[PDB]
Design an enzyme around this catalytic site. Structure first.
Site, mmCIF file in Angstrom:
data_model
loop_
_atom_site.group_PDB
_atom_site.id
_atom_site.type_symbol
_atom_site.label_atom_id
_atom_site.label_comp_id
_atom_site.label_asym_id
_atom_site.label_seq_id
_atom_site.Cartn_x
_atom_site.Cartn_y
_atom_site.Cartn_z
ATOM 1 N N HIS A 42 30.344 30.999 34.734
ATOM 2 C CA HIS A 42 30.233 32.379 35.209
ATOM 3 C C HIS A 42 31.267 33.284 34.561
ATOM 4 O O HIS A 42 31.252 34.489 34.786
ATOM 5 C CB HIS A 42 30.277 32.469 36.746
ATOM 6 C CG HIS A 42 31.621 32.212 37.342
ATOM 7 N ND1 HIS A 42 31.882 31.108 38.130
ATOM 8 C CD2 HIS A 42 32.773 32.925 37.297
ATOM 9 C CE1 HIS A 42 33.140 31.150 38.535
ATOM 10 N NE2 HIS A 42 33.704 32.241 38.039
ATOM 11 N N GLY A 143 41.337 34.560 40.771
ATOM 12 C CA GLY A 143 41.966 34.132 39.534
ATOM 13 C C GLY A 143 42.019 32.622 39.326
ATOM 14 O O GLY A 143 42.473 32.162 38.289
ATOM 15 N N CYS A 145 39.467 30.194 39.578
ATOM 16 C CA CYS A 145 38.317 29.456 39.043
ATOM 17 C C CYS A 145 38.683 28.668 37.800
ATOM 18 O O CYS A 145 39.434 29.143 36.943
ATOM 19 C CB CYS A 145 37.147 30.392 38.740
ATOM 20 S SG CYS A 145 36.238 30.852 40.239
#
Ligand SMILES: *[C@H](O)[C@H](C[C@@H]1CCNC1=O)NC(=O)[C@H](CC(C)C)NC(=O)OCc1ccccc1
Length: 300
Positions: A42, A143, A145
Site C-alpha cells: 500500500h 508511520g 507499517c
C-alpha cells in the site's frame, strides 16, 4: 512475588535490516535482506484513506518514484513485484549486515517479537501473541507499517510478520512473507471488523499456573473438570479446545495442581473474578504460552 511479564527476544540482528521506503507522500518501513527490500504494497497507493484499486496503482508505478534509504545510503530500485500484499523491490545493492534467516508463519496463540519502527528508525521491541482471528494487539501508530515480527528458535532467526493496518477495535493486522495477510484481511481502508475473539485455553492455563507459582491461589477450589467436558464448554464460550495436558506437566508438578483443577477455574472465573485479582489482572489473560511461562519462571 516475582510476577509475570511479557518479554521480547533481543533485536540486534533485526535493526540493521530496517530501511525507509517512500512513494509519493507515503512513508513507511522496509526490510532489506540481501539485494531485496520488502514492505507493504500500500506504499504505492496514491490515497490510502479510500478503497484502493491495486491493479490500477501498479500499472502507473514508476520505479524512479521510490526512495529507499538508510543513513547516507540511498538504494536504487531496479525492479518491483507484488508477492501477495507485500511489495518486493530488487535494489541495486546488497545489505552487508544481512543476517542468516528463514521465514515461517505464526499460528494462533503463539508468541513472537515486534520491532516497531517509525519511518525507518527502530524504536521499540516487545512481545506479542497471535489472536484467534490472526490479529495482534500491537501498539502501532502512524508511520510504523512495515515494522517486523520475528522469533529466534534454537539460534535460528525467523522473520514472521510485516505490519499493515489497524482495525476499528484497535487490533492490528499484518502479513507473513509469503504475502498472505494473517486472518485473510484485505489491505484496504474498509471498515473491516475483526470477528469475535476466541481466547486461547492453553495460554489461559499457563497464566493461571504463573499466578499459582507466584503464591496466588484464591481461584483454586476443590473441584476439577475433565478435558472432554471442558472442551465441550469452550466451543460454546469463545475458548479454544485444549488437545492435551502434557504441555503442563512441569507446572502441575511444581504447583501440585492438575490442569483439570485449572479448567474448572476458567469456567468459574470467566463468569467474573468477584472483585479479586490475579497477577493484578481483573480478567483472564491469554498472552503467555505455556513455554513462555516455564522459561520465565524456571529457565527450562
Ligand atoms: C501504515 O503505517 C499504517 C499504520 C496504521 C496507522 C495507525 N495504526 C496503524 O496500525 N496503516 C494504514 O494507515 C492503513 C493503510 C492501508 C489500510 C491501505 N490504514 C489503516 O490502518 O486505517 C486504520 C487507522 C488509521 C489511522 C488511525 C487508526 C486506525
Amino acid at each position: 512475588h516475582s510476577g509475570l511479564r511479557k518479554m521480547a527476544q533481543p533485536s540486534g540482528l533485526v535493526e540493521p535490516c530496517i530501511v525507509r521506503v517512500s512513494y509519493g507522500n507515503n512513508v513507511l518501513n522496509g526490510l532489506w535482506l540481501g539485494d531485496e527490500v520488502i514492505c507493504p504494497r500500500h506504499v504505492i497507493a496514491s490515497d490510502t484513506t479510500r478503497v484502493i484499486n491495486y491493479e490500477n496503482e501498479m500499472s502507473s508505478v514508476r520505479l524512479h518514484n521510490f526512495s529507499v534509504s538508510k543513513n547516507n545510503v540511498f538504494l536504487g530500485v531496479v525492479s518491483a513485484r507484488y508477492k501477495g500484499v507485500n511489495l518486493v523491490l530488487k535494489v541495486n545493492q546488497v545489505n552487508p549486515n544481512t543476517p542468516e534467516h528463514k521465514f515461517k508463519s505464526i499460528k494462533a496463540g503463539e508468541s513472537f517479537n515486534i520491532l516497531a519502527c517509525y519511518e525507518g528508525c527502530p524504536g521499540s521491541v516487545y512481545g506479542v501473541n497471535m489472536r484467534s482471528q490472526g490479529t495482534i494487539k500491537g501498539s502501532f501508530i502512524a508511520g510504523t507499517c512495515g515494522s517486523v515480527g520475528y522469533v529466534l528458535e534454537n539460534g535460528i532467526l525467523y522473520f514472521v510478520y510485516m505490519h499493515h493496518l489497524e482495525l476499528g477495535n484497535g487490533s492490528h493486522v499484518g502479513s507473513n512473507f509469503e504475502g498472505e495477510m494473517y486472518g485473510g484481511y484485505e489491505d484496504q481502508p474498509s471498515m473491516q471488523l475483526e470477528g469475535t475473539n476466541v481466547m486461547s485455553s492453553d495460554n489461559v492455563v499457563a497464566f493461571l499456573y504463573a499466578a499459582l507459582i507466584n503464591g496466588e491461589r484464591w481461584f483454586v477450589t476443590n473441584t476439577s473438570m475433565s478435558l472432554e467436558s471442558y472442551n465441550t464448554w469452550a466451543k460454546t464460550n469463545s475458548f479454544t479446545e485444549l488437545s492435551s495436558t502434557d504441555a503442563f506437566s512441569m507446572l502441575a508438578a511444581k504447583t501440585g495442581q492438575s490442569v483439570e483443577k485449572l479448567l474448572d477455574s476458567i469456567v468459574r472465573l470467566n463468569k467474573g473474578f468477584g472483585g479479586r485479582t490475579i497477577l493484578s489482572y481483573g480478567s483472564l489473560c491469554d498472552e503467555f504460552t505455556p513455554t513462555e511461562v516455564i522459561r520465565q519462571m524456571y529457565g527450562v
